[PDB]
Structure 1
Amino acid sequence: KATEPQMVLFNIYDDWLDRISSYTAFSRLTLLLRALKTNEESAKMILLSDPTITIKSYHLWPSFTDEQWITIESQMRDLILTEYGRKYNVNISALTQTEIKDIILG
């Protein structure tokens, strides 16, 4: 919607600083953006699965509770492993933890 060159500021963390440290907040940012790099619309469906939790006006990520953010970290995390196995044709049950943590981190 921007037809003109301009600077615009945004907020990644919404307010995650109260309940979540910047380390872990940026880490979950990196993971979420990896699934947005890879899975795209499905990772979106994990956000919009329950529409009764809506994205706020100021913010970017829809506001969940701590347990919900954790379970979302589980689903979103596992997405990268699933797609790894799909395209690379390498079963997850044949994998060593170093490779799983590496792929999820990168």
Structure 2
Amino acid sequence: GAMNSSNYAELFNNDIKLFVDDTNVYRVTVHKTFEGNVATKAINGCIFTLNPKTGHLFLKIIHTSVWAGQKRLSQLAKWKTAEEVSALVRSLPKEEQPKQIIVTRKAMLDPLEVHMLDFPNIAIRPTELRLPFSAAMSIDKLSDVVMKATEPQMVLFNIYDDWLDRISSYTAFSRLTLLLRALKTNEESAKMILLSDPTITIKSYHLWPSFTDEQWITIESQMRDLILTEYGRKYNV
């Protein structure tokens, strides 16, 4: 059934699985029309499909042309997500196909179940975790490729950079979720924390800076402090 605190280590076992997050598929700016009405303008989006054991990120870029002439875009976006996840699975060799797909929003279950009827052995699950994958567009290199796309495109990343050379996938996922949660709670501060030291650079083939183990512990502390801080600013505690 659902993925929650009690079965959290299942994410890091040897059964291939993917998280799917659709919160950045359909993105709009809202603006006033000359007549003083309100209209939306779509901007490019992306499906966030992540293997939490390996870090492999399948970033399907959703170009604004896919919405042209369509109605009920927020409902279409869930089906378009499901259509693209199903196409990815079919594109993978059998032994790379996931045994489970975990959606971050329950509204994806039926769209995905329906698109995956051909794969009755792939379990489609919700989760009670509140994961911060919506903040993936606060990672500059991911936001850049999304906004520059002029056509539908799939781009492959490792969201863990080279961390798995030194730490486990449980710790790598913990780090990622902490970073993303911070970026979601206060993007400016989070990015300030991540980049304040110009001697620590982001490799051309990486998403995050090249911190030593010692520097990551400090960074991770600063991110917790930020989250705690914002919780205080927010609730006045």
The Cα of 1:18 is off from its aligned counterpart by: 1.4
Give deviations 1:18-39, integer Å, cap 9, x for gaps. Answer: 1111001101100100111011
The Cα of 1:42 is off from its aligned counterpart by: 1.1
Unaligned segments of structure 2, at least 5 residues: 1-147
Instruction: Pick the aligned partner of 1:17 from 142, 164, 182.
Output: 164
Aligned equivalents of 1:6 and 1:19: distance in 2?
Answer: 32
Alignment of 1:1-106 (within 5 A): 1-90=148-237
Tell me which protein shows more strand as a share of its residues: 2
Identity of aligned residues (%): 100
Structure 1 segments, 4+ long, off by >2 Å, are none
Give deviations 1:38-83, integer Å, cap 9, x for gaps. Answer: 1101110111111111101110000111110001110101111110
Aligned equivalents of 1:83 and 1:41: distance in 2?
Answer: 12
Structure with the greater alpha carbon radius of gyration = 2
- Indicate the SS of the match to 2:214: helix
- For the 8 Å contact 2:178–2:224, the answer to whether it is kept is yes
- For the 8 Å contact 2:178–2:223, the answer to whether it is kept is yes
The Cα of 1:7 is off from its aligned counterpart by: 0.9
Q: How many residues align?
A: 90
CA RMSD of aligned residues (A): 0.7
TM-score, structure 2 as length reference: 0.37
- For the 8 Å contact 2:183–2:190, the answer to whether it is kept is yes
The Cα of 1:16 is off from its aligned counterpart by: 0.5
Aligned equivalents of 1:21 and 1:59: distance in 2?
Answer: 18
Aligned equivalents of 2:188 and 2:203: distance in 1?
Answer: 20
Aligned equivalents of 1:47 and 1:75: distance in 2?
Answer: 9
Aligned equivalents of 1:66 and 1:6: distance in 2?
Answer: 34
Aligned equivalents of 2:174 and 2:235: distance in 1?
Answer: 24
- For the 8 Å contact 2:189–2:226, the answer to whether it is kept is no
